[PDB]
Amino acid sequence: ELFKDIKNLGKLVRLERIFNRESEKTVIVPMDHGVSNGPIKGLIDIRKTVNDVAEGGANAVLLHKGIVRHGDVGLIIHLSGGTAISPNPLKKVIVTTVEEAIRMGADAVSIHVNVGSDEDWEAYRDLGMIAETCEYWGMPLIAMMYPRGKHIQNERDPELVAHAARLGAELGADIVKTSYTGDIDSFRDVVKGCPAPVVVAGGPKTNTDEEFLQMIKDAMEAGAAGVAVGRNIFQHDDVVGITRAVCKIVHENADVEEALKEIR
């Protein structure tokens, strides 16, 4: 098992609702962008998007409580908030509690920490604290760790990303979301340096499908436990198909050539 070390009945039960039993990998489609960037392309009719991603084979959707309250897969409730309109766009505060996510039937919660941002230590505490709440409630915690701030030019730097992922594991996250470092070798270092399974983010919408799918394929190669892509899936012309494509690569290890056949 992937979580043979997790000595928490609650977490094991819930984690099984977001990870594919056979492949022991996960395809998470985060759709919390509304808070950060407003109603962007693909997240305007969230009810449809969630539904397609689900039909496409995604293991879980990641949303803010407000969206769940309105509109068959795993549910991950995001706990962090911050916007691009804010005088400090990198600031993240806790906007939702673990308890709220639990009473909503969520299978997991997620937090976002911009390591390197102003007063990022406040988020260090939030993560560590929420980690304990999650441990008590048997709620699996996904920590999106990113190296972002005034002194960080390359938010994809292998050292910074590996550090950021390690931070997440050290403080208690069960799973870590982070950026792909650009190449299989450096990303394998991120994976090896992080005691918790790592999942890659999709990044902004790529120009060519082959581009995006190859990145996911490489990340899996490096040892990723799955993926957590938003924009590259819901901003695609064929949401269901592109999701299906990603599932091929992640759960079946099918190559980009066979994957692409899924894109209608």
Q: List the catalytic residues.
A: 32, 146, 177
Quick one: which of 53, 61, 76, 169 contacts a copy of itself (CB under 8 A)? 169
Site for a copy of itself in 42-71 (CB under 8 A): 44, 46, 64-71
Q: Is 112 one of the binding residues for a copy of itself (CB under 8 A)?
A: no
Q: Is 153 one of the binding residues for a copy of itself (CB under 8 A)?
A: no
Tell the residue number behind the tokens 């599932």, with chain if given.
Answer: 247
* Residue 11 or 231 having the CB closest to a copy of itself: 11
Quick one: which of 171, 219, 220, 225 contacts a copy of itself (CB under 8 A)? 171
Q: How many CB atoms lie within 10 A of CB 143?
A: 27
Q: Is 115 one of the binding residues for a copy of itself (CB under 8 A)?
A: yes
User: Kind and range of the H or E element at 160?
Assistant: helix 158-170
Q: Is 85 one of the binding residues for a copy of itself (CB under 8 A)?
A: yes
Q: Is 127 one of the binding residues for a copy of itself (CB under 8 A)?
A: yes
Q: Name which of 46, 42, 133, 117 is nearest 82 in CA terms.
A: 117
Which pair of structure tokens corresponds to residue 170?
């050290």
**Shortest approach of a copy of itself to residue 85 CB, angstroms?**
5
Tell the residue number behind the tokens 């390359």, with chain if given.
Answer: 154
User: What is the C-alpha separation between 11 and 16, in angstroms, rounded?
Assistant: 8
Q: Is 122 one of the binding residues for a copy of itself (CB under 8 A)?
A: yes
The helix/strand/coil state of 241 is: helix
